[PDB]
Amino acid sequence: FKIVYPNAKDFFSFINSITNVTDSIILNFTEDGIFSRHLTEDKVLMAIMRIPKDVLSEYSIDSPTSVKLDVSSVKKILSKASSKKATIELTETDSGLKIIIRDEKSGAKSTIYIKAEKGQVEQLTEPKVNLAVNFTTDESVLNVIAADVTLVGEEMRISTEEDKIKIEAGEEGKRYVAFLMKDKPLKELSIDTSASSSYSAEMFKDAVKGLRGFSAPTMVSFGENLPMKIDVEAVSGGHMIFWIAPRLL
């Protein structure tokens, strides 16, 4: 196989999100394109990245495969690569993976090598669930919320009011209330059925922290005691999608 993605910083962002608390990442190459999936220890936050084949500059595959790779070190070296308009490449190897970043300004062709576990392709399990609330907002908005929800409390309750979204944390003394509506600051809102759900603030923080690097609009979506879907289309094409499991009782 051979993978060329237009913007290394965007691709690095992808790696950063799915390898948040972990350093093991299972990259899967399918007929559809690249995808990688990572659940948390407590199985509440699921990080998924889809990169469709048409978005990529080059995409070759001998056969749909998965690679388990320790990216702990690759993380560090990929960042100090000043990826302005730099292009990342991933190739198949005897040893495992091969990652080459081609810098435009500096001329630096930095190539990485990591031990990969060439296993069978994983299944892209997109939770079958009708989320009545689908709002699309800036990622900065999400980060502002994440950062000041985690300041006041441990849990974040997103609810709906009359054409408004009510994010509220804080349980007794230290309460926090936010109101997100269309055009302040929501780029688009869609309330089908009046819905309300509670999420782990730490896990929302972590999801939204992964949204840094993608300036493109972010769709958030949820429903009455249903998961939250936070997905961003990558600047240079691709998908960064987070699922946060809800809290019932």
Added chain:
Amino acid sequence: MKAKVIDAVSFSYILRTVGDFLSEANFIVTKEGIRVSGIDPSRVVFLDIFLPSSYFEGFEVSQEKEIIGFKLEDVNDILKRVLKDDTLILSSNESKLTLTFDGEFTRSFELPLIQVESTQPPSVNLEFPFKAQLLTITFADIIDELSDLGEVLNIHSKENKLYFEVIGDLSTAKVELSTDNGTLLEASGADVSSSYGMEYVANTTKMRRASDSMELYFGSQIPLKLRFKLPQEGYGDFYIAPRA
């Protein structure tokens, strides 16, 4: 009470400068504005901030005199949540100080009041034999630049010039501030010399982003008054005691 700051960021900095000295204080909310006063644990710094009615766009009092107790860590923790553009609509009952950010969107932070020791504000004036009016930024600049050179800010005046010195073991750091320098807008006073704990004066720089102009009051073996001219007749006073 119900008070609205249009420059949430500047206000954010007033209360962060207080948090450098005081752990806990009281918003003393009266008809004529919100007064915050207190003395630091080392009993070297007396700070006195006054934010008048006119400093807040839409200032309403719920009673004749409201005393709002608050931990300065907790209040600055939520004030660290300011965004460049939003406004702070800080209102309160007798249970919770509710601070509301409003710009990109609406964000309210509920913060329960606490019984705070009532420090008696400086209803006493001191006479300083030297005064220097100096732009808040130009002070903020040297003090920041000097605060890494020694613990003892040795400030003295000679013929309406103001000298900041950092007299250390190895060497000395001398800064000539004059009216003819273009660094002091005005300065007149006796030729006095006194030293002050740098740490304390250092902390006072944050006011840079809250005030524009400034006044500097000092004298031989009396406190260094730092008057940070806030908008709408505002002031951030910081009396810092001298060294024996």
Added chain:
Amino acid sequence: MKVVYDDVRVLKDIIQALARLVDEAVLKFKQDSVELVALDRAHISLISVNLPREMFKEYDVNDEFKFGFNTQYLMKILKVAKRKEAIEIASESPDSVIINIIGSTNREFNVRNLEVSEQEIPEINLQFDISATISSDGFKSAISEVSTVTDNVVVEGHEDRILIKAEGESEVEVEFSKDTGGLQDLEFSKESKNSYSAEYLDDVLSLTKLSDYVKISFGNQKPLQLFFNMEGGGKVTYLLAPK
């Protein structure tokens, strides 16, 4: 004697690295250039500074002045100018040096000059098996990248490509080539694959802000030499022994 340097940041970049190499260095104010040749505390590296009189606003230096200083201290007093303010270094008596950082406020430091142990510097190599000119940004990235996985920066050189790489568990390889436009000027006499202390390079990284390009030159069993050729005529050199 009195010199006024219009751009304090250059000098700041130099001393920042210098202070990470050695505790005390000497600034030789000669009549037509300012010098500073300093071996590090462990003698595994050398930093060679040369700032010709051409770079200074004022240059009143008649006899050689030996400005000895605590590297750590000077670096603290240089950090008073974050903007493009001007440094002024003067001395009348050979035991006191007066440093002014001129700007909106005039900071004057009067330092008790230090008589410092001038160290016999060993004979430094002229010829390097690969003398390659690559961007200083590129070099910085290349070190900073490789340094995060090893303290052994294996530098490799060929007739077209310059490899700055890591050879620990995780293998990194930064490539500056003839065709890629990253390796600008290349002088070649022999292939060389040597490794240098990453933490020592990390000291000197601040030097990569002195010139757009760094003339990185090295060889097998030969020291790495970073040559920062500035404009005005300023020559900053870093000589690093192998591990």
